[PDB]
């Protein structure tokens, strides 16, 4: 038809992957499988894994920013109380 | 057309018609369905020494010809004679299965035979992609269950097989209660049964085989992707009928409705099959063929196909399964009638070829399971009696919204996921 730019994805039968040989896959009908009362007993000590790896990447930046926020806030509170109106005059303009 | 079966100490079955030659053989009621995962291929190995150069020369001197066949439910060892030598075939049978069944398993014979079934089963896996796929179909459809074992055995159970495994199998299955002696050709029943009751000696009579656990269909798939092969070969089936099912013939007729096809044969493109209107427009395949495979415990009903149209495999599968949907809801009188006529023709061409070795295998397998053979004319009575209502009731039980089993090899990237195939086993309704 109208031509076409070459891409990095094709379609079923010519996806653009490398030639596959030697790999054999197996599967079983959902119909033949245990109705979903399985997970648990086999899979709940399993997961809750992927966040043992991750929680530090989230928590430590979170901690840094929460600490930094709490500190600046408590300082602003002091500045606008009676006790701090002297420091307020100093740091303001 | 005859069926004379009578039991002395052994069970003797014959079917004679003045042809030319006569075939005599013993057919055991145990095949690859009786093996393990680990001695899988022992029956095929037995077959191959029975036909070894040593045993085969001893028969060719006497002017005898040797034939054997390993199946799932059964196993057969057959000698063809020239019909007055119907006695010298029984000599070769007993000289092998009593005398030489300790001389065939000589160290140099076994090692040269094992080396030959290894090149044999390897060649199969490397090159015979349609039968390779169909064998894997049984493997996944009937996984962890007797019907899953391949008849030729696997390369790994084969190369680890020893003389004692042959022995142990032969001592548990080559028994009297698991045997039938079969004669086809032109020789009479009383011509053979007397030559059998001539010599006595029972040999391991009273011994039963070993029992097991029943075969079961599991909806599943095995995908043997190989992008270097120039085609895709796929087989797809539901749980079909065992032999001695009420619907044995309804199933076989249903398969004849869609029949078989070859894109390069002009005549084949012209058959009265509605599916052909769909698949010929873009040439969705080089060939397909439907089957109703029946065994003792179960069977497979489905089709196999081969194609170079690797970007439209999903249309092949979709149009084929939409046709099968029709069997439950809209199959016509004249489709059923066309199938009756063609089922008779093909069932005829099977049961009455001009080759007695085929007759023996068909007789042997039948009498081992139901203790008798249904005559060709009796089948035609059953075939003609099938109504549209029968096919619909059958399809609604076996085809409609039922699990399937899939196997394929070659360029099958375009064969969609299981659930997509499985959803097409029915249609949306109000």
Residues with Cβ within 8 Å of residue A35, at least 6 apart in sequence: none
Residues with Cβ within 8 Å of residue B320, at least 6 apart in sequence: B258, B275, B279, B288, B303, B305
Tell me which residue has tokens 């069997």.
Answer: B327
Residues with Cβ within 8 Å of residue A51, at least 6 apart in sequence: none
**Max CA separation in chain A (angstroms):** 81
Residue A20: its chain B contacts at CB < 8 A?
A: 225-227, 413
Which stretch of DSSP H or E encloses residue B15? strand B11-16
Q: How many CA atoms, within 13 angstroms, populate the side-chain half-sphere of residue A84?
A: 11
Residue B253 burial class via C-beta count within 10 angstroms: exposed 0-12, middle 13-18, buried 19 and up:
buried
DSSP codes, B263-322: TT-TTGGGSS-THHHHHHTTT--SEEEEEEEE-SS-EEEEEEEEES-TT-HHHHHHHHHH
Tell me which residue has tokens 């040999």.
Answer: B203
Q: Do B208-430 and B1-201 fall under one CATH topology? A: yes
CA distance linking residue B32 with residue B38, whole number of Å: 12
| B222–A26 CB contact, under 8 Å | yes
Tell me which residue has tokens 């659930």.
Answer: B419
SS (H, E, C) chain A: CCCCCCCCCCECCECCCCCCECCCEEEECHHHCCCCCCCCCCCCCCCCCCCCCCHHHHHHHHHHHHHHHHHHHHHHHHHCCHHHHHHHHHHCC
Q: What are phi and psi of B302, to 5 degrees?
A: 180, -150
CA distance linking residue A78 with residue B184, whole number of Å: 111
CB atoms within 10 A of CB B116: 15
Q: Would strands B287-294 and B405-410 be described as parallel, antiparallel, or unpaired? A: unpaired
**Structural domains of chain A, ranges and CATH numbers in brackets:** 1-93 (1.20.5.210)
Domain ranges of chain B: 1-201, 208-430
Residue B315: its chain A contacts at CB < 8 A?
A: none
DSSP codes, B30-97: --GGGS-SSSTTHHHHHHHHHTSHHHHHHHHHTT-EEEEEE-SS-EEEEEEE-GGGTTHHHHHHHIII
CA distance linking residue B133 with residue B142, whole number of Å: 14
Question: How many angstroms separate the CA of residue A21 from the nearest CA in chain B?
Answer: 5
Chain A neighbours among B 127-166 (CB < 8 Å)?
A: 140
CB atoms within 10 A of CB B60: 12
Chain A neighbours among B 406-425 (CB < 8 Å)?
A: 411, 413-414, 416, 418-419, 422
Residue B311: its chain A contacts at CB < 8 A?
A: 11-14
CA distance linking residue B84 with residue B411, whole number of Å: 54
CA distance linking residue B364 with residue B75, whole number of Å: 9
For B208-430, CATH gives 3.30.830.10
Q: Does residue A23 belong to the interface with chain B, where contact is any CB pair within 8 Å?
A: yes
Question: How many angstroms separate the CA of residue B253 from the nearest CA in chain A?
Answer: 28
Residue B181 burial class via C-beta count within 10 angstroms: exposed 0-12, middle 13-18, buried 19 and up:
buried
Buried b (16+ CB within 10 A) or exposed e, B337-364: ebbbebbbeebeeebeeeebbbbbbbbb
Mutate to test the interface with B, among A10, A18, A27 (most CBs of B within 10 A): A27
Q: Which CATH number fits domain B1-201: 3.40.190.80, 3.30.830.10, 3.60.70.12, 1.20.1250.20?
A: 3.30.830.10
């Amino acid at each position: 038809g109208p031509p076409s730019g070459k891409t990095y994805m094709g379609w079923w039968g010519h996806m653009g992957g490398p030639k596959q040989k030697g790999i054999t896959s197996y599967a079983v009908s959902p119909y033949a499988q245990k109705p979903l009362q399985g997970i648990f007993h086999n899979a709940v000590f399993n997961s809750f894994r992927r966040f043992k790896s991750q929680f530090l990447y989230v928590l430590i930046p979170a901690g840094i920013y929460w600490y930094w926020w709490k500190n600046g806030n408590e300082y602003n509170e002091f500045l606008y109380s009676k006790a701090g109106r002297e420091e307020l005059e100093r740091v303001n303009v | 057309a005859e069926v004379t079966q009578l039991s002395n100490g052994i069970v003797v079955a014959t079917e004679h018609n003045p042809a030319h030659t006569a075939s005599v053989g013993v057919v055991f009621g145990s095949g690859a369905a009786n093996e393990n995962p680990y001695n899988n291929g022992v029956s095929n190995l037995w077959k191959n020494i029975f036909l070894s150069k040593e045993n085969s020369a001893v028969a060719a001197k006497e002017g005898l010809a040797l034939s054997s066949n390993i199946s799932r439910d059964f196993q057969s060892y057959i000698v063809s004679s020239l019909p007055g030598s119907t006695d010298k075939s029984l000599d070769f049978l007993n000289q092998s299965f009593i005398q030489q069944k300790a001389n065939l398993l000589s160290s140099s014979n076994f090692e040269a035979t094992k080396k030959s079934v290894l090149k044999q089963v390897q060649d199969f896996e490397d090159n015979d992609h349609p039968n390779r796929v169909l064998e894997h179909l049984h493997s996944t459809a009937f996984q962890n269950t007797p019907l899953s074992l391949p008849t030729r055995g696997t390369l790994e159970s084969l190369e680890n097989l020893v003389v004692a495994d042959l022995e142990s199998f032969a001592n548990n299955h080559f028994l009297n209660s698991n045997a039938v002696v079969v004669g086809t050709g032109n020789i009479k029943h009383e011509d053979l049964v007397n030559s059998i009751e001539s010599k006595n000696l029972s040999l391991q009579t009273g011994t039963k085989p070993v029992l097991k656990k029943k075969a079961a269909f599991l909806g599943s798939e095995v995908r043997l992707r190989d992008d270097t092969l120039p085609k895709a070969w796929i087989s797809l089936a539901v749980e079909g009928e065992p032999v001695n099912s009420p619907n044995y013939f309804v199933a076989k007729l249903a398969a004849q409705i869609f029949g078989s096809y070859n894109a390069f044969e002009p005549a084949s493109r012209l058959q009265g099959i509605k599916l052909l209107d769909n698949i010929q427009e873009y040439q969705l395949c080089d060939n397909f063929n439907h089957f109703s495979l029946s065994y003792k415990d179960s069977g497979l009903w489905g089709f196999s196909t081969a194609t170079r149209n690797v970007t439209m495999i999903d249309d092949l599968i979709h149009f084929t399964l939409k046709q099968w949907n029709r069997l439950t809801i809209s199959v016509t009188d004249t489709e059923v009638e066309r199938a009756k006529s063609l089922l008779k023709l093909q069932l005829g061409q099977l049961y009455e070829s001009g080759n007695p070795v085929n007759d023996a295998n068909l007789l042997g397998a039948e009498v081992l399971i139901k203790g008798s053979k249904l005559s060709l004319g009796e089948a035609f009575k059953k075939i003609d009696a099938i109504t549209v209502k029968d096919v619909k009731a059958w399809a609604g039980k076996r085809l409609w919204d039922q699990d399937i089993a899939i196997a394929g090899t070659g360029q099958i990237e375009g064969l969609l996921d299981y659930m997509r195939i499985r959803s097409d086993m029915s249609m949306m309704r109000w």
